Amino acid sequence: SMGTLAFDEYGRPFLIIKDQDRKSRLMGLEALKSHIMAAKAVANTMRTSLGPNGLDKMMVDKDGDVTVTNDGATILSMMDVDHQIAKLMVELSKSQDDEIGDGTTGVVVLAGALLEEAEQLLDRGIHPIRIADGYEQAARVAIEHLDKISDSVLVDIKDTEPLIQTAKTTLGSKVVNSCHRQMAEIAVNAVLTVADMERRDVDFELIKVEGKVGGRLEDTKLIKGVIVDKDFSHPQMPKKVEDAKIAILTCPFEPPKPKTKHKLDVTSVEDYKALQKYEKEKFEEMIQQIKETGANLAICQWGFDDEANHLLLQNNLPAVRWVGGPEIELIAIATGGRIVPRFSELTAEKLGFAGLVQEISFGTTKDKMLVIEQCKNSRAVTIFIRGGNKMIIEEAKRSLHDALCVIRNLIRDNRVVYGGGAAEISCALAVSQEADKCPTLEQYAMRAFADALEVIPMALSENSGMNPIQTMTEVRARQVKEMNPALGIDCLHKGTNDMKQQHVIETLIGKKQQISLATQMVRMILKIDDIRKP
Amino acid sequence: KVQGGALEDSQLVAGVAFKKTFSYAGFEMQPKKYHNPKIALLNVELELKAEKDNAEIRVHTVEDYQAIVDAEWNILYDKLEKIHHSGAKVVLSKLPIGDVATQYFADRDMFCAGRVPEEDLKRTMMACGGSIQTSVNALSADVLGRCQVFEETQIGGERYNFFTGCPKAKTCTFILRGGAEQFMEETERSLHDAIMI
Amino acid sequence: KGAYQDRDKPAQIRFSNISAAKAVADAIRTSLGPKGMDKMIQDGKGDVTITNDGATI
Amino acid sequence: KGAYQDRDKPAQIRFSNISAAKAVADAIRTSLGPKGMDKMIQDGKGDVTITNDGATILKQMQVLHPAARMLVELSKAQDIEAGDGTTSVVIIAGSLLDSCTKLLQKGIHPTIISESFQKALEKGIEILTDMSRPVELSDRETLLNSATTSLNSKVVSQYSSLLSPMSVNAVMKVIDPATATSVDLRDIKIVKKLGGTIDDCELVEGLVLTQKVSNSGITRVEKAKIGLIQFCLSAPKTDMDNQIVVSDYAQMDRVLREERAYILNLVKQIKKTGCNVLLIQKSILRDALSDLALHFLNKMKIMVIKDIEREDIEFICKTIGTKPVAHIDQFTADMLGSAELAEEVNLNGSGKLLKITGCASPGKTVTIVVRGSNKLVIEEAERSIHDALCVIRCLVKKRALIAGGGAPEIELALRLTEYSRTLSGMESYCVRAFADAMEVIPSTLAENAGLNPISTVTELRNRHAQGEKTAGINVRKGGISNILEELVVQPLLVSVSALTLATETVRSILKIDDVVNT
Amino acid sequence: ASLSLAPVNIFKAGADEERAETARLTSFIGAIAIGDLVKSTLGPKGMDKILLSSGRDASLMVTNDGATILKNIGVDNPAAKVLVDMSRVQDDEVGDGTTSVTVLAAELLREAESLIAKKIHPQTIIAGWREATKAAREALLSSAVDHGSDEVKFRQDLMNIAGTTLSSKLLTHHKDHFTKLAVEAVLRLKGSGNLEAIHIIKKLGGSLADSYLDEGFLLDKKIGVNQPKRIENAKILIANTGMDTDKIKIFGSRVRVDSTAKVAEIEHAEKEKMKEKVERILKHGINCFINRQLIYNYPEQLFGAAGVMAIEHADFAGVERLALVTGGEIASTFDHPELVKLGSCKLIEEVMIGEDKLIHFSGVALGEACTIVLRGATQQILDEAERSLHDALCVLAQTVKDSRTVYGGGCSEMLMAHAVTQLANRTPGKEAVAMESYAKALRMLPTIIADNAGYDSADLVAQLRAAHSEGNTTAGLDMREGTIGDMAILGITESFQVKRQVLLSAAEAAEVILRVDNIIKAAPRK
Amino acid sequence: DGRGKATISNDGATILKLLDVVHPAAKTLVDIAKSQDAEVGDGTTSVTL
Ligand SMILES: Nc1ncnc2c1ncn2[C@@H]1O[C@H](COP(=O)(O)OP(=O)(O)O)[C@@H](O)[C@H]1O
Ligand SMILES: Nc1ncnc2c1ncn2[C@@H]1O[C@H](COP(=O)(O)OP(=O)(O)O)[C@@H](O)[C@H]1O
Ligand SMILES: Nc1ncnc2c1ncn2[C@@H]1O[C@H](COP(=O)(O)OP(=O)(O)O)[C@@H](O)[C@H]1O
Ligand SMILES: Nc1ncnc2c1ncn2[C@@H]1O[C@H](COP(=O)(O)OP(=O)(O)O)[C@@H](O)[C@H]1O
Ligand SMILES: [Mg+2]
Ligand SMILES: [Mg+2]
Ligand SMILES: [Mg+2]
Ligand SMILES: [Mg+2]
């Protein structure tokens, strides 16, 4: 492990690279084995966070804040890694999360398993590129087999039971499985409310995921509208407004002010009195314009002053101030209103409508929130999460993100493979059959790919207390005997091994992305044979 | 380079594509698909601003004060109204487009993107077939751009604007997928080798 | 569901021992056979030893 | 065999708190009584402080143990409620805790100790009230004797003949004796000026100011009409950004001239009212007294004192009947104060003072000028005078008087011993502990006087049992006597509040069982 | 292999990865440390702690509140941090139960360590714990009683709840006093839950029984100089105006002239504007004027000449409470007096408390906000009294919101434990062995309550368990003599809200701590 | 790099740019690999070899 070790065949200094004495290098099979060791360490860390009986990890950051989670992407992001192959595995999980939002632990476990099998193949002397090419071949076979055994679900708003089952499968492994169906239902309703069916797009900016300590997890609900962390501007305004005609404004309720450098010169008592009357009349004109539009509520983005606040109160115009741009946008979208930049441009048509605007309390806290709901056809939505601690609230947020991403993936492609390791077992069977029909030296690489695909069912069995090899062999034999690629691991011990009957459901895009990403990253890792670093 | 996805999921767009650029409020009120849009490519800051940095207003009357306020607003609104009357349903600026302009275009059911990078702007120009305008006073169909489809879609965690359908396109945009920053970077280097070859 | 196996250090120790043993085996795999080569070993005192013998190595 | 009590840290914490409290009590035991001495305290910064005040001593010694901190807060609370007894209260608290030590050792629970202490407290309040005698605020001799008793403990006790009548006059001048239920000692202003001796302290019925006079030549004013000015005598300045743009040479001369004319009109509107003394509030953000204004005022023969503070305004108005004026339009003759004299008096080259004496509307305010040869003795004279004023305040609050010289403590000890013998149980031990603990103040008085504490306290107990409940330690004769003949009296409120606050602090400390290092 | 114990360490210098048994060890020891710390404050015979911070100011607190204790300690164990946050959230949700939720979570984790040693999976344990939580919830809800309809019995339940909330705290000395204080103060809110309406002023000095609830209102602000100090039949204008060199909000405005004479004219115009503002104010027909903002010398003079008491520098809280206590409208515009509602109180005087003067509003109109004067011998006594009063007021507010009540003295925990035991002995598998541990923790709650007094905790909890098995669903600890009794008669009752929240938050935190099999720490920022 | 950011490449010009070569004669191979990537875009490893 050194950059250059000669110093010359003549005794004269041999300096080629800067700080070559402080620099290191690993070349060849030892570099490959170091990579495999790092990847195996990461994967063996992650495999215990896989499945319903999977356990969580408690991450502590630089400043000592605690994060309890089962999400592989969050774990590997919070993990203070120094190894570059482990950094690649963190990138792998992040990529699975970006593209899919689920599978972030399966990808890592599977990639680690592929590298662990490549280890024995390299011991037997196969070229790492030949291993990578056999892995590509087997991965293509497995992807087509997934397309083959896939099923389809209806993504309609009438019967949402298949989507609820998919979301429940996604949320089975998370701490929020205490409110399993409630969480699944609200993730489904959220995406279906905010989803472009024709475009097949789902903008998550239209889903506001808010958390507030207090209450119970069961109190988490879907608001068809908006929630804001603000209150009415005056403490004597009413805390409830029903059938609210809302004026959304990005103009501070203050006297106008040019953006250009300006100096208004007062040169006489008459000029001073004119200025005074101008200010008074500006405040009165603002409030009068808001009133003549017919609004019963105003929502500004930039705060206002004492005269405007008291005039709103006097004129029976409850008002919120210092509302942020994103929530202003969501309020406009939800209430059907248009964002107005100045009072002169305000009309009865630019107003939004909410059947209820309320200020909500949270016990012995002094904190208030504003709920806007009972809109007609809100294309925006809010998920308000409650719970007994900020750790379970943050975990609920990320778990519900997983469920929303899964429903998004169904809206993008409704095809569905059955989980519990059943899809992996079926793909392993297909890859084994094709390796049997393959006469080149990659037969070994494809057999290794199959043995690696079989690590997810083994991991599920282990986490569920079952004997990995026994359970997997029995369910594999059953799959080959009675043709049913929906036969998998009974993690919850419902008796049956039929995942189609247990309604354990994954997205085809999810499994395909797992396989493809794991294989591509394993390829880039096997292609590395030299490490240099200080 | 869009992290997430497979190499076979990578793609070439016979047009131009670039990532969404720091939208303000009302951008979600804007539409996100246009089926024969005309495209205004500009080097213009569209927002309420000091008309000039060495400019100083001096008034001695509240009527003149109000006139000046309304004058700033009319300057902005006239720029926006010219852009609207050019027929352009999509608006791209190398310079910022403020929240007022964003909401104006959202109300007119137009699309706006500001702070677009210069390279992406020139590619949009070479693809759609217009010219980049520092002034909005001559927005002719000769200087406007055109594509058969404009869309904003999700690609692996990021939002991307696609101008597709340009038959006169002298430009293309590779969109590379993969599981790591360095994976995608070495993919780019490989493609650079192939392209130079 | 059998016994949870609340402890992971036994398995960790097993894997550590296996790794060390495999490392030794893979280190001397090159000194095996007619086509195998020798290793030079410089002791801490500086006593040099060239050898193909596994026990000696 | 009950519960094993597997934990010993609660008891260890109790004993540590008791030890700290007893250490504080034993540290200040020497500053108790007429024969008690003072402590010097050099702060970390080097600020020296000589004092006999328990609250001052404890606040100034940066105590670190929690229980000792709590005793500091206790002495401060006594200083608030009574202003006298801040040493007795700490000593009583320390003694109650030192007795809780052996109670705990006997194996009594802190809760039982606390409740029995509450019982002893209620019985002791009853006993002290029975001992007490009512007082009329017309009883000037009783007030003088209360003040003299309060001062006997301090460095200013050879000057009691001078500072007791002043401490009675001040309070009797700042309260309506028929309706008053309390006193605000902010009505009594104290002005510490170095120089002279403590025999030079003075009670000024009018007003005293340390601010200097701005006029030269006008130091004395008879038949003085005084005005408070909350506006600025300088060139006009709007609250908004204002400039004066000159574009012609003539406008320059015009600017100077019009400024002169503005200032002259101001000072003329001031002179027209008959004002000859002018108090100008302190003004940052604007010059309150320009040189032009001073020139014109001096030419008009008006004394000027600027830099008056915005916190002394209500006091100055309460004193000399002035009304603060913030706009020249409202500056008229009815907004002035008439004083028979206003003079800048010199103190033997030791500084200057503005004295506004004589007043047609001298409203319930007085000032005390404290003189002295050292900063330390001046500070302690101020503290002692405050203690005397607070004793008179206790007398105003509660029209009841109690004998001194440890007579209340001995009577308390005795009658609570009797109460303990009647309340047989485990409360009996705790009440007897409360009694013998309060029997420590007489012991301290005796030790400090120089007597045999055991013999003195035994004679006191014996005479109080015979019936002489107004019997105490006569440090003048050197033994026991009727303490009212020595005229050692103190308000019942002092003893009662000391007992109450000490018992509450003791119960609080007894409810503690652990210490954490957050 | 493992991330840490591998031939290659995959971590940056300063990081760490505790694995399964090591992680559960540090988690259980941290949680049980937190719990053992916070107990001994539990119950009537609970004792207080000295916090004794270590910063350079060295704040000193004497507390019996578990939330306060946990907030003010330097915790570095992650599971302990979880329990700390749990107690903080308890104090946010309700105002009581912050020591019971922590002790319960710690006892559940102790039982969970025992079960893991018994070789049970920390998913079979979580399953059984969720079933037991359901059973305990339903038993509690069935045991709850409501009296909000009957006004007299609701008053009695409020008094009992306040007494039970204060029993553990330093105010149990004067419990019958502070109970009445807190109940009257929470009923003066007339159904609102605004605890900011109840202002608490801690005045050093006096006895703890000298504390009281002012029949009107008290304010620690000053009156102007030439202005009255006593006002009978006070008409009050509550405001938030500037009244302090109040400039026109046009900020480019500048006075640019060519004459000091013109500058003086403009200055006089500013003063005339302030005078007209004061005149518009006075046209409301007032005797008192309270402003959230300052009041400068000139408006002070004007109010004095008008005979108006002008209180300045009240704050947002001050004017809110004043509006609640008098009926007025906080105003900033005075061009429509017919629309501005004024406040009323029979009298406004200046009173003495300790050595400080305060504005006293007596005979107020509404009274929907309150002032409580807390007297005491030490600042520590005063802060602990404020915390205890806050506890009691929060609980009474939550009860006025939800009149459901639940008996205390371990009766509720014993009833829930009985339900969990029935479920367990009717349930097969090792989930039954985890339900039994749930029940053991629920029982260990009153066990600890009794331990803190010095009684035969084992004997008394056995008696309670037998009673709740026989059907005496109201049996609880009688902590006067050290026996068992009828909580319904002794008046030891809690808010169903607080007991349910204790149960659920404890079970949830124990679940989330039990799901952890790895603790991956990142290099400290240092 | 010193910042800890890794670059993974099969491209010889890239690899040699990243190697902090300081030998005056061995800088010439890095330079000609750069020149090859400039003029052609392929052959960077072949040129050095
Ligand atoms: N109810 C269930 N029964 C059997 N297997 C399940 C069940 N729920 C989830 N799984 C399996 O556990 C695996 C891991 O899912 P999960 O841990 O939720 O996310 P990730 O795929 O990111 O690890 C999936 O492959 C799925 O097949
Ligand atoms: N000429 C040869 N051809 C093939 N194999 C050989 C030959 N000579 C020795 N071997 C094999 O080499 C191995 C032993 O080689 P060696 O390096 O001495 O190892 P060891 O120390 O185990 O004997 C045996 O398997 C032996 O059969
Ligand atoms: N002339 C005196 N003879 C006897 N006892 C006195 C005399 N003067 C004061 N005392 C007693 O001294 C005690 C107070 O002295 P002091 O040192 O001021 O302590 P504290 O700060 O507690 O008042 C009281 O018990 C009082 O009765
Ligand atoms: N007078 C009493 N008799 C019996 N038990 C009581 C009494 N007062 C309170 N408790 C019990 O003490 C527990 C509350 O103790 P406390 O120290 O206030 O902790 P927390 O902060 O959890 O409320 C509850 O179980 C309550 O029922
Ligand atoms: Mg999942
Ligand atoms: Mg004294
Ligand atoms: Mg409590
Ligand atoms: Mg090439």
Residue numbers in the entry:
A (entry chain E): 3 to 536
B (entry chain H): 199 to 395
C (entry chain d): 21 to 77
D (entry chain D): 21 to 538
E (entry chain B): 2 to 527
F (entry chain H): 51 to 99
How does the study describe this entry?
The chaperonin TCP-1 ring complex (TRiC) acts as obligate folder for >10% of cytosolic proteins, including he cytoskeletal proteins actin and tubulin. Eight paralogous subunits (CCT1–CCT8) assemble into a hexadecamer of two back-to-back rings, enclosing a folding chamber. This architecture facilitates nascent protein recognition at the apical domain with a built-in lid, as well as binding and hydrolysis of ATP in the equatorial and intermediate domains to drive lid closure for open-and-close conformational transition. We trapped endogenous human TRiC with substrates (actin, tubulin) and cochaperone (PhLP2A) at different folding stages, for structure determination by cryo-EM.
For the cryo-EM sample, purified endogenous TRiC was mixed with ADP–AlFx, a transition-state mimic with a similar chemical structure to that of ADP-inorganic phosphate, emulating a trigonal-bipyramidal intermediate of the gamma-phosphate moiety during hydrolysis. Image classification revealed that 89% of particles (that is, 2.5 million) were in the closed state (closed-TRiC), resulting in a 2.5-Å resolution consensus map after imposing C2 symmetry. With this map, an atomic model of the entire TRiC–Nb18 complex was built. In our TRiC–Nb18 complex, the Nb18 nanobody is bound at only two locations of TRiC (one per copy of CCT5). The binding interface consists of complementarity-determining region (CDR) 1, 2, and 3 loops of Nb18 and a hydrophobic patch at the CCT5 equatorial domain, proximal (~15 Å) to the ATP-binding site. The CCT5 epitope residues (for example Ile151, Met485, and Pro487) are not conserved among other CCT subunits, suggesting that Nb18 binding is CCT5-specific. Importantly, our closed-TRiC model provides unprecedented clarity to intersubunit contacts within rings (cis) and across rings (trans), through three salient features. The intra-ring sheet formation is fully visualized in our model, and the consequence is a rigid septum mid-level between rings, acting as a barrier that constricts the interior into two largely separate cavities (one per ring). Second, inter-ring trans interactions are largely maintained at the ring–ring interface by fitting the ‘plug’ (α4–α5 linker) of one subunit, into the ‘socket’ (α14–α15 linker) of the subunit in trans that it stacks with. Third, our model unravels an ordered-coil preceding the N-terminal β-strand of each subunit, reaching out to the equivalent coil of not its trans stacked subunit, but to the +2 subunit in the anticlockwise direction.
